[PDB]
Amino acid sequence: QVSLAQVSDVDKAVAAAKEAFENGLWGKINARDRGRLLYRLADVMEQHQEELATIEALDAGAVYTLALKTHVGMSIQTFRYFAGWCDKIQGATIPINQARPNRNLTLTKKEPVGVCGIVIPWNYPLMMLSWKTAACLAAGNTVVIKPAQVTPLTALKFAELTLKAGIPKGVVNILPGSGSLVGQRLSDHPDVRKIGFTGSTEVGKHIMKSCALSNVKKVSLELGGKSPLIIFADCDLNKAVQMGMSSVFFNKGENCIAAGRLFVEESIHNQFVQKVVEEVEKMKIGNPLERDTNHGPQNHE
Amino acid sequence: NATEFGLASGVFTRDINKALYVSDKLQAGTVFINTYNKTDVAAPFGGFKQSGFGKDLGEAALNEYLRIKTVTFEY
Amino acid sequence: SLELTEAELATAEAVRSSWMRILPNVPEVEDSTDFFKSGAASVDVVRLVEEVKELCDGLELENEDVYMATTFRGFIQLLVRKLRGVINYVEKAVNKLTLQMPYQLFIGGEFVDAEGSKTYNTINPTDGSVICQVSLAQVSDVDKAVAAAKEAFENGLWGKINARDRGRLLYRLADVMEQHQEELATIEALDAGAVYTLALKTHVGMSIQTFRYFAGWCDKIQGATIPINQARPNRNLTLTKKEPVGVCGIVIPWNYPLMMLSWKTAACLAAGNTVVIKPAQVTPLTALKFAELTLKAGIPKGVVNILPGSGSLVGQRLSDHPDVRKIGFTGSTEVGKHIMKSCALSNVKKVSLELGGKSPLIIFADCDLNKAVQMGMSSVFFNKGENCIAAGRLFVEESIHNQFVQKVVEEVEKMKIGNPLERDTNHGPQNHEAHLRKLVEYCQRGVKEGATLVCGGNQVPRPGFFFQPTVFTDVEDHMYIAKEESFGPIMIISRFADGDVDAVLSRANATEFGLASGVFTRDINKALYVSDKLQAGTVFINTYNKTDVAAPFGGFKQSGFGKDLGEAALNEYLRIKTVTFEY
Amino acid sequence: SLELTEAELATAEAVRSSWMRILPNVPEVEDSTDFFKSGAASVDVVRLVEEVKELCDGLELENEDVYMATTFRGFIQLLVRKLRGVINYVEKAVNKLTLQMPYQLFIGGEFVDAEGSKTYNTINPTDGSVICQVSLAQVSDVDKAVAAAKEAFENGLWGKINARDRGRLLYRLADVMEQHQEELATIEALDAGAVYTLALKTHVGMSIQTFRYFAGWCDKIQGATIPINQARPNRNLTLTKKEPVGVCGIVIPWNYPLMMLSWKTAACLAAGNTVVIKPAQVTPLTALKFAELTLKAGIPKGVVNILPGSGSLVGQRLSDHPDVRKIGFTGSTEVGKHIMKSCALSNVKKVSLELGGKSPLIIFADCDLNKAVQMGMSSVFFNKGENCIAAGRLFVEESIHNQFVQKVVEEVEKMKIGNPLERDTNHGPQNHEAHLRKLVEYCQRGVKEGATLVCGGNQVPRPGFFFQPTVFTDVEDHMYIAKEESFGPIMIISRFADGDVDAVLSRANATEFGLASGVFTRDINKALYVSDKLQAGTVFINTYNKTDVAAPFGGFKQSGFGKDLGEAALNEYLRIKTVTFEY
Ligand SMILES: *SCCNC(=O)CCNC(=O)[C@H](O)C(C)(C)COP(*)(=O)O
Ligand SMILES: *SCCNC(=O)CCNC(=O)[C@H](O)C(C)(C)COP(*)(=O)O
Ligand SMILES: *SCCNC(=O)CCNC(=O)[C@H](O)C(C)(C)COP(*)(=O)O
Fold it and tell me: Nearest CB to D42: which of C36, C164, C231?
């Protein structure tokens, strides 16, 4: 059983985040110091990589061999990458028109916005969290994450490791629950200045609408698509069949950049399909913890 | 290209003239050539028309979370 | 189509002989034979033009027309046409000049009337009388504009030509505007009511600087090549390309007709987009004059489109239209919120907002007073009050409070009020009648609460829409005038105690807005400290109203997001493709 | 090579079964069959490692080992070896620790003696006595180092691995240095004579920060995609790639043994180069300890090479050698000119110089005095005088001249002199004996011309190479001490009149050098004006000795060219290829 968040709990999270930003230690310390903490977080995740990968297999139903490479692997690479940026975010000094004979000097400074409210999808629990959270913390912000209801366990395990890594209290906040209750409140709340989102179009349109009405807050959307894949005759077939299957059947179908349509040329159409069917028969189906398994079970009912 | 979406796309060919030509004309965020599912944390990622706006991953990912102050002196 | 004479065939055969020599193999030059498909270099195009000019005396041929007519029949037909083969103005005589103002719509490089020949009057605020009638746009006209813009982008010449070629056209546009700088400045003085000396420097001057700046960027928009993880032992190569979005729908305010048009349009065209501008109803004439100059500059037809009319009719339709991919806006918060809501519902289109703000201006004792008084007035009373980065509140220190206000009143008396065309004039008339009415209610409501009116705060006994420069003192934070924006020539002064930096910052930052701010001090420690703590987009130190086309400009919390001017401006109008190889 | 048992064949057949399942088609797995040439993804490498670990209990297998052994026989042979199948230190007990210092050369990840077992003694300046003998490099040894470096670059593992992988190794190196930070700091105190409290902050501290900084850059070095002129109607695509140059030959000074090594080496390795370091003869021990930690960090053998010896023998050969493509140098102008000369004659190799300078420090009356005295001393007497950006001259204003000097003398008396390991010590002993001798001649020649000696200017009656903090006053521009660099704890004070900014700038700028400069003032107008006019690389305002690894650092006229630290540092060690397509 997992705890269901309420409106009262959201208020405490945003309040804790604002205190951590303004009066807290996160804001006071140097950019190089923030980068060290984010790099230390990645080393802690590396130690518990087998543990996190097993939780993904139970929660999301992801294959274990894939989970180490993709789900847990990229998450570690993400926090290591954006840790480096922390003390490499430079402004500029602009050569503007001098009010002759007097002199002038103009310069720019890049600063954090404040509190952020991330909402992640269910296809990649840990990876989508990492992509947004790492970049947000690197800039020097406090975060209020909202994981998917079907897959909350990866996010709660990540929260445990922030204490070990030694992140100041209030920076990272996590609230497992329903999207319509929690997600809608973050949009309406005036303290929140930024809403990250990755999901569907209909749901995505509602957030941008709520963002405008609330306090003209910033927003970035990442919606689904119908990606084509053209295959000409001149290309080698054996590789085209491998990468053809690997576009569609990667991570048991559930992939935001999955091949929606395959356009194949007439000369190699019949030959292509014949090779695909042969390889699909060889694909193994079973328990994701077993190493022999290739294809795993779907995320939820 | 006849689609409201445009997140990713792909093409398989040996001929270089096709690869470079098709990559330009394909209205999509991420184009792959003789590969597929090859993202990197350094390389940016995002949609075009009705696949949202902004970017995740890379240097462009920081810009959305930052804001620019502009100080001006006179002496 | 055209039939050849006896002498024209002798020319045609001489051209046929040249094609054989220029091209490498070429077994036979028939009518169907294409020039470039045979295998013609960019050097061969120059050799062709020169060789043809040797035959025919004169014949003003260029490299562009060769790219148009690729085939042999198409080339000969075009060449034969060269050998063998009106805008309705409103005249007005003012300022030792004869003005010529277009008064119609502008769709596809052609001045045309609206559906049903509907019109509306535009006012001259100096005298009060009408100058001319202007065409009122409709929903049917908007469809034609967006259709023309889409054709110009996709199938038109704008997309095909090089980045360096686009930059040359945008630079040529600026040179044309420079020639007609006195003409444009006079139209501003009649339409908007801006002072002539100011209009040359600010209104018309920056417009020219804008198009010159963003012309340079056209062929300096570079992507990247990313060092990604190689799938050992195989190799990989990733690169990014910055591209145009497509069609854009700009909506500009009335405070700066020509300048706000330039800021958005120049950056949009530099990226390589087609535009559908919507000017303010009160001030359309500057935009229609700009459309005339694009024909002279030699911009392809369909690129620039202008539709004078009401905001609720035209502006709302652009948001709803699915072909439009980007909405630029500069105005009020309430109106701005409506566009972002419509943007989401339509087709999740991109948007950048530029809303008004209540900018503070702190003045310490250590600063020199004479300069502080000059720049203090120049913050408030610049461009007859109407300025988006105007000083909303002035926090003055107790030691120099009484001394400061005394000097301000002396200088306000010296300020001249009259016709904006006259050089002696300093302060000019307000933009339109509806604006003047609110400024009277603003000052009336100020006295009610209990703000000590020093001078002004009422309409001038004069024909027109003039208003007296006003000064308020003893203003608290809880008052209405402290919170709400005037958007007119009204100075609001406040007190703060000696040697208290943290307290005054708390009062200054206590606002939902945050567009601009200022501070005057000699001490370096205060200047750098205060600049950090001030929650605002643009901070000024010992200066005010000092923007540049190179320096970026935009708000923070409830003053929109995104940036106008500088390199950051281009990022809004561009989109990043990411190509990835494997070998 | 190794024969199989009965049980090992059962394991081999289980592995053979896995290869059939993992790979797509694979008609038959034989000894010749390669894993990747068949068509194996990066996911398949993980599936292999896991499947093999299910069979054999334990077996610490990693993905790196799979990339080494691609073939089936190579994989099985390697796998069988896993199942079935000293550094000479100099001990010394000081500072509640037991030190372990390598004393040999370092060529190809191995500590080895020189040709003929030639050695030289290294001195402890605190006591005066010898600590150990160190190996003296020869011409034959240089050839082995450059040969090892070239193999590591071309055929070695360093070149093959990803940019992100290189960054991880450089970050792991910093963590190893952090663990041995107290050990490295103690060696500095014995070798260089640096104070222990300072050594942790400056010498060892910045070294750790350097490698952490440039580790981040490894996978953030991006090229570009240029919008060039399309040969209409054909298309074109241009892009740039930043690549390593090859082998590099660094030569470091004696003032900061470990820090100057880090500044150049970290940036060089980050770009993706192999290095041949040449440390100073007086201080080799810090570099040899650093070489030990590269083995622990897990750097491939051949990447880092270190050759302690004479500069004229080793340093000259690196310049002459054609395999070397880049020479980093930090020292004097006399020696610096000789390297650039040799670089041209050899094989037109690249070079970046970092020479000494005579940095001014202007002090106005309006600035607060107590802070000016602190930072005034901290400019001159930082790191026992020996600092490349030390304050050469101090221009003080007449009003606060007498008051300033009085406060300096009081504080100089309070300064502690003793053993650098003791925490109470402030000022430490000079680096070596030959340096101390010149500082005596410097102060003797100063008094001759007629400079008022306030205090100091002579050797301390003590065992070691200590020197008294010195202060000179009433110094003219024509004098020797005004022009020539001391490179020791000697404050040179001068006078300038009240309210004369332009005159004092003329005196300050009147010098062939220009590395650093400083100014103390409260008034913002002076600070910004003086900073512009001062012809120097690094200007400080109300501070001094405040470098950062992010901020760039380099000279102007006769203080070399190029930059150390920051993003600009990488550009020297990289080269730009430009690929161009047509389609
Ligand atoms: S919603 C976006 C989902 N993300 C992805 O599809 C990216 C996952 N891909 C990878 O982690 C690598 O590209 C894999 C498939 C493991 C191949 O890496 P290999 O060639 O080193
Ligand atoms: S909505 C933003 C309105 N724009 C401005 O306030 C910028 C106008 N200012 C200028 O063009 C110059 O800074 C002025 C004050 C006209 C002249 O400055 P001078 O020092 O060259
Ligand atoms: S040859 C170049 C000489 N380098 C230096 O003088 C730089 C050494 N300075 C520092 O490490 C810091 O700037 C110190 C002096 C420790 C002050 O740091 P603090 O203000 O954090």
Answer: C231
Active-site annotation holds for C343: no
Dist CA B31 CA B10 (whole Å): 5
Contact present, C174 and C294 (Cβ < 8 Å): no
Helices D285-297 and D181-191, interaxial angle, to 10°? 160
By most ligand atoms within 8 Å of CB, the mutation choice from D203, D359, D374, D547 for ligand 3 is D547
- Its sign, for the CA torsion C264, C269, C275, C279, is positive
Where helices occur in C450-500 by DSSP H, the ranges are 480-483
Report CA Rg, chain B: 17
> Quick one: angle between helices C6-22 and C42-55, nearest 10?
150
DSSP-derived secondary structure letter, C108: S
A244-266 core/surface letters (b: 16 or more CB in 10 A; e: else) = bbebebbbbebbbbbbbebebee
Interhelix angle A49-59/A31-47, nearest 10 degrees: 70
Contact criterion met (CB below 8 Å) for C250 and C426: no
Q: Which of C388, C397, C443, C572 is catalytic?
A: C388
Residue C244 to residue C256: CA distance in whole angstroms: 27
d(CA D149, CA D139) in angstroms, rounded, equals 16
Residue of B nearest to A193 (CA): B65
In angstroms, the CA D363 to CA D498 distance is 11
Contacts of D40-45 with CB under 8 Å at 24 or more apart are D41/A242, D41/A246, D41/C231, D42/A69, D42/C231, D42/C232, D43/A65, D43/A66, D43/A69, D43/A70
Confirm or reject contact between A281 and chain D (CB < 8 A). no
**CA distance, residue D21 to nearest chain A CA (Å):** 8
State which H helix or E strand residue C410 sits in.
helix C401-414
Whether the Cβ atoms of residue C395 and residue C530 lie closer than 8 Å to each other: no
On the 0-12 / 13-18 / 19+ scale of CB atoms within 10 A, D445 is: middle
Burial class (CB in 10 A: 0-12, 13-18, 19+), C444: exposed
- The reply to whether A106 touches chain B by the CB within 8 Å rule is yes
Q: What is the resolution of this structure in A?
A: 2.9
For C64, nearest residue in chain D (alpha carbons): D232
Determination approach = cryo-EM
SS3 breakdown of chain D: % helix, strand, coil, rounded to 5?
45, 20, 40
> Is the Cα dihedral D530, D532, D535, D538 positive or negative?
positive
Structure tokens that stand for D345 in this block? 């004659």
Does any CB of chain D come closer than 8 Å to the CB of residue A105? yes
The backbone torsions φ and ψ at residue A118, rounded to the nearest 5 degrees and listed phi first, read -90, 140
Q: Which of residues 316-375 of C touch B (CB under 8 A)?
A: 325, 347-348, 350
Helices C181-191, C163-179: crossing angle, 10 deg rounding: 70
Q: Out of A95, A213, A218, whose CB is closest to C550? A: A95
Å between C35 CA and nearest CA of chain B: 20
Identity at D113, one-letter amino acid code: D
- CB distance D201 to ligand 3 below 6 Å: yes
Please state, in angstroms and rounded to a whole number, the distance separating the CA atoms of residues D333 and A27.
Answer: 45
- Report the binding-site residues of C for NADP(+): 252-254, 278-281, 311-316, 331-332, 354-355, 438, 485-487
- Chain C neighbors of B21, CB-CB under 8 A: none
For residue D459, give the DSSP letter.
B
Question: Which residues is A104 bridged to in the sheet?
Answer: B74
CB contact under 8 A, B56 and A131: yes
SS3 label, residue D152:
helix
D93 DSSP β-pair partners: D98
Give C-chain residues touching D219 at CB under 8 angstroms: 227
| Residue D567 CA from chain centroid, whole number | 15
